Design a protein around this ligand. Structure first.
Ligand SMILES: Nc1nc2c(ncn2[C@@H]2O[C@H](COP(=O)(O)OP(=O)(O)O)[C@@H](O)[C@H]2O)c(=O)[nH]1
Ligand SMILES: *C(=O)[C@@H](N)Cc1ccccc1
Lengths: 85, 383, 205, 82
RNA sequence: AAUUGAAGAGUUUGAUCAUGGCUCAGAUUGAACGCUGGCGGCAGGCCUAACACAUGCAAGUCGAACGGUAACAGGAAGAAGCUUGCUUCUUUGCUGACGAGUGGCGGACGGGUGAGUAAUGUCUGGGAAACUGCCUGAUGGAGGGGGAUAACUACUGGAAACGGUAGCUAAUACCGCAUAACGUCGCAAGACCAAAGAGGGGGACCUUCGGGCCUCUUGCCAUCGGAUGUGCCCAGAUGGGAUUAGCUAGUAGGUGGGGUAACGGCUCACCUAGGCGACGAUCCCUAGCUGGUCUGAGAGGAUGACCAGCCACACUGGAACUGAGACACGGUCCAGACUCCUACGGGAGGCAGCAGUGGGGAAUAUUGCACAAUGGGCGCAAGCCUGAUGCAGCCAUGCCGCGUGUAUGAAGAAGGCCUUCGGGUUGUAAAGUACUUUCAGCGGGGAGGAAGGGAGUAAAGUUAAUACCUUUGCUCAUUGACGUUACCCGCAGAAGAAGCACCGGCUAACUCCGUGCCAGCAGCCGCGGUAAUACGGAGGGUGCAAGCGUUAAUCGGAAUUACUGGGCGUAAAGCGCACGCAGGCGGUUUGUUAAGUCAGAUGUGAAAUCCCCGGGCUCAACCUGGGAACUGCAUCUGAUACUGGCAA
RNA sequence: GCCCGGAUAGCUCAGUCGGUAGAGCAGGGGAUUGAAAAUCCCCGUGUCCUUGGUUCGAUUCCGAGUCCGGGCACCA
């Protein structure tokens, strides 16, 4: 619309491209650990978590993730690696 | 809507009158085309005006004055629109074809404006590109001069401007040369008319419009008085006399702030619909004229060879009465002793109209009936 | 809002005097009283009970110059108070400022007294009042604006009140032309010739 | 963040301010938490013209409730020392 | 002081007493119609088409964030006239300030509508599996580097909208490195994660001459909090129809994975076959809820406009993004309908935001002024935006207040009218006469709504500091849309200001004349058939008053839905009879429990409204302090007569 | 504003192509009665919307205008 606050359109959409790109990369790491559980390598699964731990934690402080869901992945997946090992 | 209109150029209301196929419309678009190259606020297109059946009012202005042109219907079947078209004349332009010469109907166009009082006429002898023989142009010109001479006008002193509206509209300099000198005749033969601005306000209701989204915009050129946006002005018509207040005024889609005599403006009222107001009423000052159903007058009836009647009518005869914009008919009670009123009589008659409207003494008016003008006069008595 | 008509015609209806025409004279004596409420006034009424309830209200309401809608509100306030609802109506109707100045004698008649108030002439406690329906409070002093004192209307007016009863719920000075209001009006301190009992039953329905 | 503002009541041309404790995101004369004292700028030169309970203000200030500059001016206007 | 409160009449029949419907007497409304119309004060004002909309306006802001400055105003260098500093004036971001751009914040509030919604909502009272920007308390940190881009140049697509390519550069933009904790995961050991700098002032020192450094202010990150808001779950209450009786299958529940801030069929995979239903499911229709308003003695019934709290919608439908928060009125993407522009390839638009318009409709108004006050957003502040709000204009729509004059005045006139033609009546009514002057009209003084803010200045703290800054007094010029204000003084003349329904009974109040079951009146009973108090006119009179009546609507009367408070032999009404489940009710003695119940305490029952006592506008209407009330619910602690559960 | 349809006694219509306007349903006036019906005795009350013209002559010929209804516009 014809308002000076149409800035929020292009600006927030520019924010959409950035945030969306970061959200997929966070998820693909989780796909690695789920493949790790199906692979049966409890040591490699532990190693799988070794690269994604500083990932979601760095997303937590940015407000990108609600911080609660961040710790939630670190909970169940830990429960997964001890289920196999 | 927008664009505040400037009150700098003197405004003289003009207009081309003529006949069918003559070129009233052709010249209208051409004059603005000619004035287009002297000022970039003109050049009214041919499809802009449109035969022109409605009283089309476009404008053009020279670097000296401003003009409100009217493109009236030069047709006999559209005399009533022509009458109201002549309701804003400060000077006119007669379009006469040098091919079929001055027509008896074009002759009729002169007399209708005369009984309502046209001050000056700039006769544009049209269709000049049809013939270059000057003596043939002279006889057609002199016949128009003869026409105005026997019709109480300076036919011997009427400014005859030759020319063809055809190529003048095409942009041909030679024929555009006539149009430039045409404007020369308009500013000299027609001086600044009378505009009684300090008189009680009166504005004839000519046309009714409704701009979708803004309201009612009635129009007309003010005869006298001054109005301001916010002032309460009432309306007297054939219906019950009503009232309203001014909420705006834009001329030619250009804003104005004060209504004054001379300017053909479009005033904006306080939320009235279309079914209340119609052509014929009068926008005036609070409590000036009240309607009546009984009045007398002093009228004269002309001959049919000139344009009036030929046979004497009787009592009960019901002709339409016209005072600058009114078309109210009425039952006539003839004076005792005069059963038959022959063409040439200058008697009085008691009138009992059918739709009450502004009736006041000293009201110069004309009378018509059946398609012809029976005569004119002045309302001296109001019962 | 006022009557603005013949001040004796309505009084001839009731038969009882309403003091609308007291003036300098004591009693009229020439109005063909008690037997002429109008044209066919000689014939005595059927006197239905519904009418007699109306006859006391219309009698008393014209005494104070109050009108129906306003008189109904005095009643509305009368019911929400304590004591006697019948006597509540009496004190409030006397509570009007035009009524208290009427007992002082500063006004010959109430119609005279009403404009007296309405023309900024009365200045109670040093406060000018135009409202005749001003609810007078206990323990206060009413007075007259100096510009509007001894203006020929009050001259002949004060000597009239000498034959009046001059109630005990107030006191006039007439030396400085001032009025001091005492305690609230008692039922026995008023005329007591009217029957206000029927009025509370009138608005019962 | 809640604050101590002024709820402008009273009729046309003759107001009467009622100092309230309300939410910032709410309306002037709308939802609030509590009302404490009032403010009568058109009061007569008489007994009462301005009232306000200092303690309830301090209790809310203790959690972090801000005060409007006009309202905070009333604190100076009620003169805690005078 | 705080509910001191309840009326009936007419009409069935020849008459009566019942039963029983019908109608009127009351008050009110977001009103409308008709007639008339003086002003002021305080409110209200599109209920129908949630129908379609022109234009303007309704949300911007920070240089104390950054690169910059196209403009406006100066400094400064310079330059030209020529009065040699009086002017003209080309460069210059070095300043004041600053369009356009980046970025932070706001835009989720304020505002409007009631289409949808019968329970996802709302109200009432509890509850736990959460989140929480701006604000604020507590405790530490605030170390060090890198890579792009907009604006801007060059070129260029397209009518425009709106882009495209290659290069330019900064940051409180983005992305790392380091450091990690009472923070996160885990039994633990351990592992892992953050950030941003500017502005003012200034001494020594230092100055690659940008500045560091010191100090003050402010901002930044994380964590436990708190205040507040929001989300979620349960219980009770929240309409009509049974001529709607079976419904449901991600549906009832469980295990596991995922998702959500959080819990869960929220969603999937397998398994189980159940869950809802007469104290009414589903289905159909209708409808925003409540606080309240009107009526009512109360209980109830009706209703939900305005002020206020909540929910939902935003052209129709749908999805999602950003962010603390929307799944969003003045944001986006898609399809559809309706408008518009067009250079026909393709785009623009949403008034149920103020006004305003066509149309609908019986019917509801201005395209005003201003940010002076309160509130909101950004900002250090100054200010700026603010159709919130504050006021003004139109309308008798409501309530309240007031005026259209007072006193005197008998030939007891004129005229109208009636008449037993005697006279009566209009009627102190008028003229006449002596006075007054509100409000209107006009002319001058003159409140209050205004608290603050800016500059200057002293003192007290901060600090190396008499500086900056912060705080408290004081001084100066002051900030008012309304506004020819409120209010007051004064001048002129009774001067400018009364109508409307009704008059047989119900129901306060009559005759005459004219029309003859004709015309008409009318709430019901009924009037008029040639002597009408009911039709029409005139006079008189009654009621009310800038309003008066008609009409529509709700309640009252209606104890004609009876809970308080009705009936059934014949007036409306005992199933034809009987058995019997669910349900209702249940002798008497004792013990016991303490659910119903009772008393008391506690939390809650928002505010305004209604009630009592006071206060402020001349009074009132209206506004308003305090108290009371809010007749209900939840929990705790006692009591044991009655009812209920258990046992004899 | 433009273009048409109805405008015919109380009501609905016939009758035109210039030659002195009809019918039906009505309704009403009288004799009889307390008053009507039934019965009997009599019946047209019309500016053809109005007005003007080509006239020995116009409802019918050409037209304006007013009233009402039905379609199109125009957009200061
Ligand atoms: N030769 C010539 N023809 C003309 C002239 N004016 C008009 N016309 C023609 O007449 C026709 C109609 O012209 P118009 O202006 O519509 O006339 P109106 O509307 O009756 O005024 C057009 O087609 C022109 O060609 C003229 O001056 N000369
Ligand atoms: C509106 O434009 C008026 N000022 C002029 C006008 C034009 C056409 C018809 C009537 C008036």
């Amino acid at each position: 619309n014809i308002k000076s606050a149409k800035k929020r359109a292009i600006q927030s959409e520019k924010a959409r491209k950035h945030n969306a790109s970061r959200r997929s990369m966070m998820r693909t790491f989780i796909k690695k650990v789920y493949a790790a559980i199906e692979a049966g390598d409890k040591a490699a699964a532990q190693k799988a978590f070794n690269e994604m731990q500083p990932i979601v934690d760095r997303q937590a402080a940015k407000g990108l993730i609600h911080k609660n869901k961040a710790a939630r992945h670190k909970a169940n997946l830990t429960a997964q690696i001890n289920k196999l090992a | 809507s927008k664009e505040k209109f400037e009150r700098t150029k003197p405004h003289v209301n003009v207009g081309t009158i003529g006949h069918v196929d003559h070129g009233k419309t052709t010249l209208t678009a051409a004059i603005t085309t000619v004035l287009a190259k002297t000022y970039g606020g003109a050049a009214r297109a041919f499809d802009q005006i449109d035969i022109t059946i409605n009283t089309s009012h476009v404008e053009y202005d020279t670097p000296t004055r401003h003009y409100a042109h009217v493109d009236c219907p030069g047709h006999a079947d559209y005399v009533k629109n022509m009458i109201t078209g002549a309701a804003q004349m400060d000077g006119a332009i007669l379009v006469v074809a040098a091919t079929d010469g001055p027509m008896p109907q074009t002759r009729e166009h002169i007399l209708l404006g005369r009984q309502v009082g046209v001050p000056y006429i700039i006769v544009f002898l049209n269709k000049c590109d049809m013939v270059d023989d000057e003596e043939l142009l002279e006889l057609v010109e002199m016949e128009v001069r003869e026409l105005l001479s026997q019709y109480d006008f300076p036919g011997d002193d009427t400014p005859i401007v030759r020319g063809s509206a055809l190529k003048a509209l095409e942009g041909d300099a030679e024929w555009e040369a006539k149009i430039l000198e045409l404007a020369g005749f308009l500013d000299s033969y027609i001086p600044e008319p009378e505009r009684a601005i300090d008189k009680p306000f009166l504005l004839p209701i000519e046309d009714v419009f409704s701009i979708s989204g803004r309201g009612t915009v009635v129009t007309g050129r003010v005869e006298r008085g001054i109005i301001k946006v916010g002032e309460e002005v009432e309306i007297v018509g054939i219906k019950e006399t009503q009232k309203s207040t001014c909420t705006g005024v834009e001329m030619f889609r250009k804003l104005l702030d004060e209504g004054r005599a001379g300017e053909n403006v479009g005033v904006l009222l306080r939320g009235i619909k279309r079914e209340e107001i119609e052509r014929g009423q009068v926008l005036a000052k609070p409590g000036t004229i009240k309607p009546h159903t009984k009045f007398e007058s002093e009228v004269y009836i002309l001959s049919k060879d000139e344009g009036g009647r030929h046979t004497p009518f009787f009592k009960g005869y019901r002709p339409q009465f016209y005072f600058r914009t009114t078309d109210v008919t009425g039952t006539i009670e003839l004076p005792e002793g005069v059963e038959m009123v022959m063409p040439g009589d200058n008697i009085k008659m008691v009138v009992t109209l059918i739709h009450p409207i502004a009736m006041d003494d000293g009201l110069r008016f004309a009378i018509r009936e059946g398609g012809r003008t029976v005569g004119a006069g002045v309302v001296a008595k109001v019962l | 809002a006022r009557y603005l008509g013949p001040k004796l015609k309505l009084s001839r209806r009731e038969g009882t005097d309403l003091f609308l025409k007291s003036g300098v004279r004591a009693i009229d004596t020439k109005c063909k009283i008690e037997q002429a409420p109008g044209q066919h006034g000689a014939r005595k009424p059927r006197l239905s009970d519904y009418g007699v309830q109306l006859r006391e209200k219309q009698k008393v309401r014209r005494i104070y110059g109050v009108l129906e809608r306003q008189f109904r509100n005095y009643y509305k306030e009368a019911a929400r108070l304590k004591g006697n609802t019948g006597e509540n109506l009496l004190a409030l109707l006397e509570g009007r400022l035009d009524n208290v100045v009427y007992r002082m004698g500063f006004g010959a008649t109430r119609a005279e007294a009403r404009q007296l108030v309405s023309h900024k002439a009365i200045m109670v406690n040093g406060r000018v009042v135009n409202i005749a329906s001003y609810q007078v409070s206990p323990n206060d002093v009413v007075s007259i604006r100096e510009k509007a004192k001894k203006q020929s209307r009050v001259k002949a007016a004060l000597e009239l009140a000498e034959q009046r009863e001059k109630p005990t719920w107030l006191e006039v000075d007439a030396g400085k032309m001032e009025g001091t209001f005492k305690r609230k009006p008692e039922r026995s301190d008023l005329s007591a010739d009217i029957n206000e009992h029927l009025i509370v039953e009138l608005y019962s329905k | 963040m809640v604050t101590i503002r002024l709820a402008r009541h009273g009729a046309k041309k003759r107001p009467f301010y009622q100092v309230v404790v309300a939410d910032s995101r709410n309306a002037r004369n709308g939802r609030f938490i509590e009302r404490v004292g009032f403010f009568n700028p058109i009061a007569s030169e008489k007994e009462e013209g301005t009232r306000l309970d200092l303690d309830r203000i301090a209790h809310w200030v203790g959690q972090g409730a801000t005060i409007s500059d006009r309202v905070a001016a009333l604190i100076k206007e009620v003169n805690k020392a005078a």
